[PDB]
Design a binder for this molecule. Sequence first.
Ligand SMILES: Nc1ncnc2c1ncn2[C@@H]1O[C@H](COP(=O)(O)OP(=O)(O)NP(=O)(O)O)[C@@H](O)[C@H]1O
Lengths: 12, 346
Amino acid sequence: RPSRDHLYLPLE
Amino acid sequence: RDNNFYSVEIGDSTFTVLKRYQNLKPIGSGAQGIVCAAYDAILERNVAIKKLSRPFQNQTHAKRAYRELVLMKCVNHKNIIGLLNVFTPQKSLEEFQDVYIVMELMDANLCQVIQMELDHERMSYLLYQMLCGIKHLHSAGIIHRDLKPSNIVVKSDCTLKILDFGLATRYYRAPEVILGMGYKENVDIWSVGCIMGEMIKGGVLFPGTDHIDQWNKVIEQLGTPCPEFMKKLQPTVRTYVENRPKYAGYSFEKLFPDVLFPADSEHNKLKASQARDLLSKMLVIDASKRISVDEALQHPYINVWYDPSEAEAPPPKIPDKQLDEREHTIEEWKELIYKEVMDLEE
Ligand SMILES: Nc1ncnc2c1ncn2[C@@H]1O[C@H](COP(=O)(O)OP(=O)(O)NP(=O)(O)O)[C@@H](O)[C@H]1O
């Protein structure tokens, strides 16, 4: 299963 | 009891909250007032705080608020916003005025995500999460009917949650809803089609000012529905659909042209066609030909992220049954709601 760790939305 | 609270002004309104919540700042707004971020000194994490002002002032407000309490309490799924705490500063049924709902804190709603640069990885994951949360609701008989970008929140880690539990102007409401017809679970799949489509094209697919303008913008795009649909409308409404100009609409090639997707890598035109495909399974006017939640999750564009622990979770145990179909006097609602606030506070 592909990793979801690096998924980022520039919201901070 | 009053020793446990302190008050702070948030714009116009006063938030009187337990002392554990520190540093309130406004994070958004809507119908039911303003919503703040806070630091929970007990849990030692940031949380969100929503103030309901007189949730019991009239039947509509009370019915809605009571349902939300009960449902948020008993539902526990990562893609549905979770209740952390609920309290009231007033110290007795008579003085009872306000309800504060404490939630997990997210960074933004979906409106911001749309005005933003994306890729298939993140888009597929966001859509995958929406589907999970919906499926979960459906598994308990909750059918939303009112999914919109403003009531869906995201975190910078690209995780997503649905802020509310739908019905017991409207760009995202399914055709079968604007036309007072029957609906099943996949009525929510329309909403997801609109939102997906909206992420891609950057702007609202169907921006009507009222029920009339809304429907016309839908047939203009997908075309006038088949004869097998126009006579599924009750006599009164079946009069309108066979009374306005008939269009052919556009293919999903013209509505979502190749140029709208990255077409470099061989696998990026793959995803592009996969995405276009799902949209055409979702934005099907006739709610019978329309793909379902379980089906979408299986679709190749989406299923890369599949995990049974989240896509196939045990349904919520909703312990109120009569829930969302009971009627009481304003005085009885005040009691119900108060009772429910007192019982649910940690
Ligand atoms: N738990 C939360 N985490 C992050 N942002 C939130 C949270 N709750 C609300 N918001 C923000 O506040 C806005 C208000 O939404 P919300 O208070 O849920 O009501 P709504 O979508 O405005 N309309 P309604 O549900 O009828 O009251 C949202 O769009 C979010 O931007």
